[PDB]
Design a protein around this nucleic acid. Structure first.
Ligand SMILES: Nc1ncnc2c1ncn2[C@H]1C[C@H](O)[C@@H](COP(=O)(O)OP(=O)(O)OP(=O)(O)O)O1
Ligand SMILES: [Ca+2]
Length: 341
DNA sequence: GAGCGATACCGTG
DNA sequence: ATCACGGTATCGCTC
């Protein structure tokens, strides 16, 4: 099959740049402000102008201001991005009925039955970059190859505003040459677990014995890596249906006082129930990030759907259970709803 | 031996 | 020192 992946460049920033074009050329950093102290929080994304200097998603806002104190610092407007994203997405549906929306920012199309070869495919990805630039003034990167993983690796290798095909010969090349840590799904913890085992390239997972590999990363990621290195990975493009929806909020100050967490918790329920629309969940999970930045949950499933009032009273019970069964103070509290009708 | 909710870990956005 | 999603490993229960 032939897979075409679209990955919007610097999406949150670029949307801010489309809306306020005075911003082009300047470093923009979309932030998520927390409210413990002035400029506490983290970076959600920056544009290339800011990324050049080490201002990337995940760093604290204070560090980003130490590097680029004169950049534009914008509060995250996710609702807006989500709305633009939706419209870019309804636009990708013109090019294939088989479409898998992977994130706010990313979609895969199986165009197998709308092109014959990768030159036709390549051609369809210029069209699509054009259409999106025309309608929404947003640059994207396209990656084309014979499955989702190598279509995503192609986009990585081509961004920003790129397009690249990874034909069957280049796939065999990468399986040998490409550092396994750049394979989607291999993050730092498992990258290291591999290097530990000498695994540096994908091909390497075929000489190692399966249960040494399984015993180290998981049967599933083991099988995942092996199927790639055998060039036998095919995962169909499948439509995403959201499974959970939650919200966590950081408290002005740590605590384990029940009457002190309760308003943040209840704020988190309100927000999440609004984010649910007509989705009725049967499961609720309360979520506390410890003072130590660990994450510890407590949940309950129900024969029925969960009303907000059920949500309010069950969540307090679940938070009580978090505080008994642990001694660590709470930095942020939230909830996740799931198992929808 | 292996199928099921709770819960943690791990990846990416 | 953000928030969000969602896949998989592990346990204990259960057949
Ligand atoms: N750590 C993060 N926290 C919050 N939002 C994030 C984080 N990483 C990425 N995002 C959001 C903002 C990005 O616009 C969008 C897509 O991410 P990604 O493709 O990794 O980066 P990019 O589009 O900024 O280049 O996801
Ligand atoms: Ca992107």
């Amino acid at each position: 099959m032939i897979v075409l992946f679209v990955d919007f460049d610097y999406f949150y920033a670029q949307v801010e740049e489309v809306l306020n074009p005075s911003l082009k050329g300047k470093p923009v950093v979309v932030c998520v402000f927390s409210g413990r102290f002035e400029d506490s929080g983290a970076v959600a994304t920056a544009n290339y102008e800011a990324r050049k200097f080490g201002v990337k998603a995940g760093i604290p806002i204070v560090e980003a201001k130490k590097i680029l104190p004169n950049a534009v610092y914008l509060p995250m407007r996710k609702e807006v991005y989500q709305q633009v994203s939706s419209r870019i997405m309804n636009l990708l549906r013109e090019y294939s009925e088989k479409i898998e929306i992977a994130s706010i920012d990313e979609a895969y199309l199986d165009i197998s039955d709308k092109v014959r070869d990768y030159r036709e495919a390549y051609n369809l990805g210029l069209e699509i970059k054009n259409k999106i630039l025309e309608k929404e003034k947003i640059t994207v990167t396209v990656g084309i190859s014979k499955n989702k993983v190598f279509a995503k690796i192609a986009a990585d290798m081509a961004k920003p505003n790129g397009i690249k095909v990874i034909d069957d010969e280049e796939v065999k090349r990468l399986i040998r040459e490409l550092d396994i840590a750049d394979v989607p799904g291999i993050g730092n913890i498992t990258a290291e677990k591999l290097k530990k085992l000498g695994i540096n390239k994908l091909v390497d997972t075929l000489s190692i014995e399966f249960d040494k590999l399984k015993g180290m990363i998981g049967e599933a990621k083991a099988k995942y890596l092996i199927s790639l290195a055998r060039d036998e990975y095919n995962e169909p493009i499948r439509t995403r249906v959201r499974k959970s929806i939650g919200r966590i909020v950081t408290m002005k100050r740590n605590s384990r006082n029940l009457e002190e967490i309760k308003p943040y918790l209840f704020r988190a329920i309100e927000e999440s129930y609004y984010k649910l629309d007509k989705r009725i969940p049967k499961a609720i999970h309360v979520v506390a990030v410890t003072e130590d930045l660990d994450i510890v949950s407590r949940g309950r499933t129900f024969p029925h759907g969960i009303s907000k009032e059920t949500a309010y009273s069950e969540s307090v019970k679940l938070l009580q259970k978090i505080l008994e069964e642990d001694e660590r103070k709470i930095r942020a509290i939230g909830v996740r709803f799931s198992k929808f009708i």
